[PDB]
Write a protein that binds this DNA or RNA. Sequence first.
RNA 1: CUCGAUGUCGGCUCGUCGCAUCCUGGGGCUGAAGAAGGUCCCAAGGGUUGGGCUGUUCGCCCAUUAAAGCGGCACGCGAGC
RNA 2: CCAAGUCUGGGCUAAGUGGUAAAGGAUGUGGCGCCGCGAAGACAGCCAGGAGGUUGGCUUAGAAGCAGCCAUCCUUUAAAG
Lengths: 174, 180, 136, 138, 37
Amino acid sequence: IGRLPIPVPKGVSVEVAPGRVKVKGPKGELEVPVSPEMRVVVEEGVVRVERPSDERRHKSLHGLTRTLIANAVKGVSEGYSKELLIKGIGYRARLVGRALELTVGFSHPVVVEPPEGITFEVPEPTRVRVSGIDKQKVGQVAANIRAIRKPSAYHEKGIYYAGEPVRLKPGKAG
Amino acid sequence: MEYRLKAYYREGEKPSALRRAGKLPGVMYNRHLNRKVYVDLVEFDKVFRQASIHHVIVLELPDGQSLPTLVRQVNLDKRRRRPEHVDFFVLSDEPVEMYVPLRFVGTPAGVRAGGVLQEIHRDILVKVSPRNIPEFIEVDVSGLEIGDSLHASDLKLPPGVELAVSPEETIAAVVPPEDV
Amino acid sequence: RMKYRKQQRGRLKGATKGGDYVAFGDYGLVALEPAWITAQQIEAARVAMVRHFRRGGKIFIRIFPDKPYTKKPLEVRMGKGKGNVEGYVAVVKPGRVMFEVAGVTEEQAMEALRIAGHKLPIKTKIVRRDAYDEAQ
Amino acid sequence: KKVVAVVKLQLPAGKATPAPPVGPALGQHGANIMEFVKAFNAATANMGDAIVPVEITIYADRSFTFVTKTPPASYLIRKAAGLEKGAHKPGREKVGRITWEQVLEIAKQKMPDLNTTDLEAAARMIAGSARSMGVEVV
Amino acid sequence: MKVRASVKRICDKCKVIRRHGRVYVICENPKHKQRQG
RNA sequence: CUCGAUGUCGGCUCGUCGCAUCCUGGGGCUGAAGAAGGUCCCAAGGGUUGGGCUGUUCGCCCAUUAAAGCGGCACGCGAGC
RNA sequence: CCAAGUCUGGGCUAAGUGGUAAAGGAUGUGGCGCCGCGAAGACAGCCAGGAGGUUGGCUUAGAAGCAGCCAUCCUUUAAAG
């Protein structure tokens, strides 16, 4: 009925492997997992997740494999870039090539090294974030950076994903 | 309106097995004639539930003998309530034993006056009027504070008049939740 | 608590059911699995209700603070004539008609009770009569 | 920091800078005491002793005030009526009680600004907010 | 915030999050770390 | 059980688990600006001074300290004082 | 471990509950009755408006919903706080 519906365009290399569905698009044959009963189809332009029963575990499973491989593919069509905005009079942003940089923790040696699909975009450096390939991996790294110097809901000099409105805890007397 | 499905062996044992089934024991009684029929709970209840149908009888279809009945006695099982045995009277004509639905408007002057809240003792009435009384024996009274109380006296006996209870005693009254 | 002017020393031990049930306002506490209960604690619930309510609409009652218990000494050895009377309570053991009117016209009264008891001294539930009840 | 929009101010016509609603109020909220106040004088000064409510700021039409708009329900009702402050307590007290016709009449009297306006709206509102304060119907 | 027992949401939009039997309420209010696991 | 018998205080000497953690870190929280506080969950690793007077373990006082914790084993210890 | 089915049949948990405890607290899990609803085409998702006496009681420095003790209505359709 509705918990398994997706379209598989692009001439996507959307192909079932040995326990893993290999979704190949720009570079990575993203591994979108596969459980034994789930089972799925991809014909012409239609991509469907199967439901070998209708219990709790499966139902979720459906939502999963579905949205997931869904990902795998839409992804492979593009790649995946992360929208991160650094903002803080107490911070600098520069790529250096294959590395973090940036700081508010007054002893700037902030040397990271974009794992993979991850590339660094500093055109600012306020608007400055990353690109990846792996839906999550990207999110995760972003969090890495963010958290490592970010929080501040009362006075702020931080790194913000999209830049959520974040709290505004007043201070001394007022 | 109501109905039922017949018995065989009673007093207790079998009926119990019934409860099990989903049927509680039923005593079928009329002016000096009687036999046991059985209670299929679920619906039994629904109707019962009507309550207006617990005071004011209705027609029960049993084997086709469409007849008139009211509750005259019953055993609801303390341990969870519900029953231990359901008892009714099918009635010819002479209705004297009536504890029928009682309504009244306590035309505010209580909790919207002295805060006084209205306690109801009767809510219902047991008098006479052969196979003839609705779901509303009724009365009313704005007086709702001074220590005020209304009784079987003032009463106010509509249509098929017939006080079969007492020379007063009160229907209810205004209690000071906090004075007045 | 209350039992003023009693008549004797004490009761003793036993118990398994009774005869509490009806209704009486339709704001009721159906005691469920118990034993005696401190006339005081009782007062607890009393209060509890009283306050929850907007502080006036009057509740009712139920089981009385009828019995007297003794821990006997204060903590000594054990042999006195079980002397001394120290606690006074109600005695309800098989789900009972704990009767609490008030005029809250609400699951509000529900609440007040709800906890007065949830607290109280045990396992119990609450409700309203629905099999009515016929007296003389 | 300085929130800019019409600031509602309930005041006493003839007067000119009510401590509570116009002293600080106008000033910091988005309006202003003595000047909004005196233009006001110019105006509400001829309608002030049964409740004078107006909303003010430096607003469109390019000016200072905004809209002088009929005394609140209950305030004008009582204010035409009789006793003093709120009935200390409404509903339970039943200390202030008006009269039908009298109601429909003052009702039409000030009626103008009435929400869409009508006899029923006027008298009915009178009873409603009237009771609201302590101005019940009797 | 932890309490072996009680936890009954309150940040009003306060959430019943099952985390390893961990009876934990998640919210948007530091006040509500409802940890009763 | 124990009396044809099990030597009970306190203190030494040598301790050994416990955690409801004193000090140590990890922590979400604040009525958290910093700082320093207080509030709980995780974690016993190591650490967990000297005197005074009192047969007192307790305790009060002196001077420190990261701290100078509670308590299990006949309130551990006479075949060891 | 040691004699004897890692029987067959239909179920439920999955925490190892086997292998110990309460008051109590819960979108656990599974099971059955009452309500509103997909064609007065639903709900979570989501557009826009979130109304005019409402902004009436003590405090009135403020209840003039969102300080607190009383009311519990009027206009008017997003429909009605």
